[PDB]
């Protein structure tokens, strides 16, 4: 694996920080990672889970 930064907490980059429906729950909280994970390789794994992979429901 490899580990994301949330604010102080960490989680595996394929996994969500918060679920279900990450952005649809809390836009101004979903800001927190997308502030600063821009330099990290895990950004497009985190983005898929948070915003695109399977329209926040089932499987790709």
């Amino acid at each position: 694996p490899v580990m994301c930064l949330l604010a102080n907490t960490t989680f595996p980059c394929s996994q969500p920080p918060c679920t279900p429906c990450c952005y649809e729950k809390e836009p101004e909280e979903t800001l927190r990672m997308l502030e600063d994970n821009v330099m990290r390789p895990g950004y497009y794994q985190l983005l898929q889970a948070s915003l695109t992979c399977s329209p926040h429901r089932q499987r790709r």
Binding site: S54, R57, Q58, R60
Partner: protein, 242 residues
């Protein structure tokens, strides 16, 4: 003309996923959309979604987004195809429940070409069955449809077979190895409450013919490869054969 063809037909366990594929070929037009439409076992007919297979842009109804992936393969990138044009589409259904059971069609859509209008569907493929159920493959019980003293000689009559508690519907059945055809019935299918199938088959006859003339039922199952070609003589508590 254009032909639409989609691969196979299927039966699968709940919670699994399915991937249908489609070819469109031989049309004179190019940027057309391919759409997927689904028909229940006797309930209605629905648009799921579609794609324009050059762009790979996809559209869905709100019920199927996040259940489904619709996608296509790049056909040719060079500014050519004086050869006949073709495009290939695929649909995935995920986290299946019994109520997702239907026949699925790909169809050609003129919506983008007609000034980015909403769709009307111009050509359809032959359709594919996708079946969701817990039951595994099982061979039939193959009983004679037993006659009795319930009318006796001289009347109108029928002699028959009852096929029970198998799975998949291709228990394709016939009479006298093809030598009989008039006055027959074989029913469509019955979905058993156990998640299995049953079927009724009969030949109508003069009641004097039973237990003296020869009548035979050809139970062939595609699953389990059964071939129960047999005669169906009178036996209810009495005994009889010709």
């Amino acid at each position: 003309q254009v032909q639409l063809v989609q691969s196979g037909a299927e039966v699968k366990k709940p919670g699994s996923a399915v991937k249908v594929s489609c070819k469109a070929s031989g049309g004179t037009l190019r940027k057309y959309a391919i759409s997927w439409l689904r028909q229940a076992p006797g309930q209605g007919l629905e648009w799921m979604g579609g794609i324009i297979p050059i762009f790979g842009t996809a559209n869905y109804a709100q019920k199927f987004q996040g259940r489904v992936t619709i996608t296509a393969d790049e056909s040719t990138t060079t500014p050519y195809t004086t050869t006949p044009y073709t495009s290939t589409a695929y649909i995935e259904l995920t986290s299946l429940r019994s109520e997702d059971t239907a026949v699925y069609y790909c169809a050609r859509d003129l919506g983008p070409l007609t000034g980015y209008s909403y769709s009307y569907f111009d050509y359809w493929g032959q359709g594919t069955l996708v079946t969701v159920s817990s039951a595994s493959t099982k061979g039939p019980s193959v009983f004679p449809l037993a006659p009795s003293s319930k009318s006796t000689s001289g009347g109108t009559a029928a002699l028959g077979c009852l096929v029970k508690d198998y799975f998949p519907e291709p228990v394709t059945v016939s009479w006298n190895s093809g030598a009989l055809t008039s006055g027959v019935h074989t029913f469509p299918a019955v979905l058993q409450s156990s998640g299995l199938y049953s079927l009724s088959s009969v030949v109508t006859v003069p009641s004097s013919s039973l237990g003296t003339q020869t009548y035979i039922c050809n139970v062939n199952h595609k699953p389990s490869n059964t071939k129960v070609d047999k005669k169906v003589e009178p036996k209810s508590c009495d005994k009889t054969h010709t």
